[PDB]
Amino acid sequence: MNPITLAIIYFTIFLGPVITMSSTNLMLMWVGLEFSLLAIIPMLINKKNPRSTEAATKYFVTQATASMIILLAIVLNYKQLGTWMFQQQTNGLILNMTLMALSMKLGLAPFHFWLPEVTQGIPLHMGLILLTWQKIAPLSILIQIYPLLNSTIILMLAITSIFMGAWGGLNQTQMRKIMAYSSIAHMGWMLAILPYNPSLTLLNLMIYIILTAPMFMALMLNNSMTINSISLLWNKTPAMLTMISLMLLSLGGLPPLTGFLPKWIIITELMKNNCLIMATLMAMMALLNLFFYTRLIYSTSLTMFPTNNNSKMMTHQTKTKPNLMFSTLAIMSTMTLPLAPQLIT
Amino acid sequence: LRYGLLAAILGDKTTKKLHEYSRVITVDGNICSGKNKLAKEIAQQLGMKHYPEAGIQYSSTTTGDGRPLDIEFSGSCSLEKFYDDPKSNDGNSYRLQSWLYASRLLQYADALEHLLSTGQGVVLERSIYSDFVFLEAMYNQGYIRKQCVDHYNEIKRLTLPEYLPPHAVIYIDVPVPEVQSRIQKKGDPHEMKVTSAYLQDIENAYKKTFLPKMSEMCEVLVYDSWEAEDPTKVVEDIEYLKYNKGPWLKQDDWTFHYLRMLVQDKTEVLNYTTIPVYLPEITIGAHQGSRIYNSFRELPGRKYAPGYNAEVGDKWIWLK
Amino acid sequence: GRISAFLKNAWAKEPVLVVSFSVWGLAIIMPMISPYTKYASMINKATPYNYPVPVRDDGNMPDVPSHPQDPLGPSLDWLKNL
Amino acid sequence: QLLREHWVHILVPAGFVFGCYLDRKDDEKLTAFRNKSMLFQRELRPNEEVTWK
Amino acid sequence: MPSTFFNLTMAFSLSLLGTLMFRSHLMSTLLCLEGMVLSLFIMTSVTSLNSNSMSSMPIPITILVFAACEAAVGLALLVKVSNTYGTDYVQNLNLLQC
Amino acid sequence: DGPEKNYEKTLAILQIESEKAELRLKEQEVRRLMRARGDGPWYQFPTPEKEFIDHSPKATPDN
Amino acid sequence: KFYVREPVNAKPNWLAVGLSVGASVFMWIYLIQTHNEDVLEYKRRNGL
Ligand SMILES: Nc1nc2c(ncn2[C@H]2C[C@H](O)[C@@H](COP(=O)(O)OP(=O)(O)OP(=O)(O)O)O2)c(=O)[nH]1
Ligand SMILES: [Mg+2]
């Protein structure tokens, strides 16, 4: 791609969620959703391989179906209430279809079957763009209508999201699929805390984003697609294993890392609203998430997997690849827990 | 200023800096047949940068101080040991082959970066497109195994189509008895311990497999020794050579820019040569890797990034 | 000199793009030059697609006319003389 | 050059002095009930202004 | 109007169920997607004309334009699938499972 | 220093902790009551704006 | 001259050094001025 279409595509990718967040109209949040989808599709099919085409096709058909369901809900609300916003008395069926389609857009379970496959087959920076940027707009639409949604449907969607995400991330080996089921579990946490306190939903979203960014940067340092590929990182870049361990433990929610704070304050608010059984099941599935994180840590940092012979030449070569804001996001995603009252509102 | 998208926007166009002599020329031949001298003369009288054969210590000579490092840092594979005993149980043969392919890949990346940055043509000796010849020769001689062949083919499939084929491939056809006579006359005692079966395997791999895949996508210039041993007719053919086939015609400025980024980042170049395929020939254990990596780190000038090593005279470290 | 030669031999070899670009530039600049540009908006304002609703006056406003056949009000003599 | 060579030996004593300072700051912060406990409610001596610092 | 709006919503529901139940033709899937798009256009237009909402009659034009660009993107993707596989069969799209 | 210093420091700490406890219980009650019947600053869900309503006389008199 | 290739960081980027040092100095001075202004504003508002 030449810089003209690079700038246009990145500007529309930026602009979609910005229109969705800045917009007070259901129609404009919709059109921002397909700015995001349409602008990001050439970026998935940038590599021009059958796997990228497969991911782009599945992603397109999923988002198209969900966007048509969203527009159905918008049109039905427009007939029922004469306005372009779910104000207070729109139909619960309409609100549930809206929640259905936004959960389909997000890729949380049981609508999660496309997210690991779409995350696979695309480059790592597009996995980062998807799993971080493409979720703010559906979260924005969900946050705008928090008192109207159905707590039962949200709680079911959330608990099965964490269940399927924990089990998948336990299952596979591929880094992109691991990050995708990690995203599914984290979106389950955000969705569960959505109807009671959207501020904690935003806090969990920012914590997940600042944890997902240095994962993907560290993967892009060596294009480590595999558990083995990140396992020989000690020969390639040994000065990163400590932060890999700290940020993966933060993703697991282990104190005193700052990734414990979203799960902790979410459990605290859920128990303020008396859903103890739900909170316990969520925390146990978070322990499963921490299990596959700990296996990944064992593979990459605490043990030293055998290496190759060309790694000598790769160490002979130099590198200027790792960017400056990797360390800033890494430190903010590891050592921010004593600033918890400042992080929460 | 480091090359990038900003430099491409401000104007660093490869097609703007191209000229007639901006060509990739590769000289190929058997073990001892006039390959070095002809490439040097062609580059000298065409105004082109000559790249000799990438040996074991190519990365050592191109990185750091440029002195050859120890063998355990540079591949831990000996061509002399391979000539003395090619069927050794430690896997010296396939380690040497993979290390030489990695060296040739680094040399091809350097030559491509030089051509895309300065516009000067390059004359390489035995680039990556004619190293599977040595691979298949050792496989047919039984020196390596089918798993090594599959791993080499996988690495070649991973790395090879990302770059551009050479504009011209000049080949030196030479008989095996002539190669044997030249090897005996050279006087390297390890090098006389090579088999005519191995040399015939190299020549057969050339004739049957390397020349056609060059032939449908670039210009092939097979010559004898007597057609060679005079670097004027070959240069005349290079002058009267028309490049009307291959993917070089379809390249434009932004494809050149992305290829320039790929060849200017050496880690992406050698990314797929270190895939976690655990052949016992090339797999190195954690303890040996730890010791070798550590000793390479207290090697002088290699502890930190270049320009940050105070022991070699780098200044303003605190200020940068 | 060179710019004038570039437009000149461009007009020589192909005038379609030259005429289209000149028509583009003229369409940009002529609303900023002609004095009739405001009159289109004035005419569109003066065109009465809706009923003018009468106002209940308390006598404190003298600008509004009691009768349509009065000197007071926005007459369209400029429209007649346009 | 002795201060340059053995500058690492002051970090732990500096941390000790800083910890004593922070204990003193906490002690003067928690003075909401000084000379107000009913067990120790006594009239102040003329030569003193606080029971404890 | 309520009977015809109910018919339009059942048309959208049938097109959605057809989209959700795949057959061998991604072209047929895209056609079901535009069945949903067309049903959305008629419901929006009839609602606007019934409510006399002249401020919101641009909304059908915007849904038509946006959905048409989205389907152009999808047609380009189907062209890529047909080029890489010979056909547009959705069961050829399955090697991202592992 | 002496036992009275620790005694009165403990008194101050207990006073601060008890005040924090009753404040947390009261803010739980405040949030529950305000969410149940929003009539104060918090939990004020949005409402369409009256400033975007046309009040000029229109073509149809029956409005 | 040790390295065979000219290092990127062989010489310090003087423009980057000057911009970083001036930026840090500017934020420090602005921080002190805003802290003093906030202290004065708080005392004026609360009558202290
Ligand atoms: N096994 C093996 N040996 C190689 C490979 N590449 C080069 N060699 C050997 C062949 C020679 O004995 C030695 C030097 O390479 P050359 O082909 O340049 O030989 P030499 O310089 O003697 O002859 P020349 O005049 O350059 O053709 O390295 C390779 O990929 N594998
Ligand atoms: Mg030679």
Side-chain angles (χ1 to χ4, degrees), chain B residues 30-36 53 79 82-83 96-97 100 104 125-126 131 134 138 186 191 198:
Chain B
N30 190 358
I31 280 181
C32 186
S33 67
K35 185 182 49 63
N36 165 63
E53 204 150 354
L79 178 67
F82 158 70
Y83 280 162
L96 173 80
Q97 204 50 53
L100 280 170
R104 282 181 219 278
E125 292 178 24
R126 210 179 272 148
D131 192 75
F134 284 92
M138 305 202 276
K186 181 165 286 294
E191 213 191 15
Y198 184 70

Side-chain angles (χ1 to χ4, degrees), chain A residues 119-137:
Chain A
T119 310
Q120 201 77 15
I122 68 178
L124 280 164
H125 63 275
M126 294 298 103
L128 158 72
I129 290 295
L130 175 68
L131 291 182
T132 53
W133 186 248
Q134 289 301 290
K135 301 176 186 295
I136 315 182

Side-chain angles (χ1 to χ4, degrees), chain B residues 61-67 300-301 305-309 312 314 316 319-320, chain G residues 1-14 16-18 20-21:
Chain B
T61 47
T62 49
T63 50
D65 204 6
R67 66 185 184 273
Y308 288 97
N309 295 280
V312 304
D314 298 328
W316 314 100
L319 203 55
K320 81 207 155 187
Chain G
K1 188 268 183 181
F2 184 77
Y3 311 100
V4 288
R5 292 189 296 272
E6 182 65 26
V8 176
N9 296 115
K11 297 296 289 183
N13 194 1
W14 289 102
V17 166
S20 57
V21 163

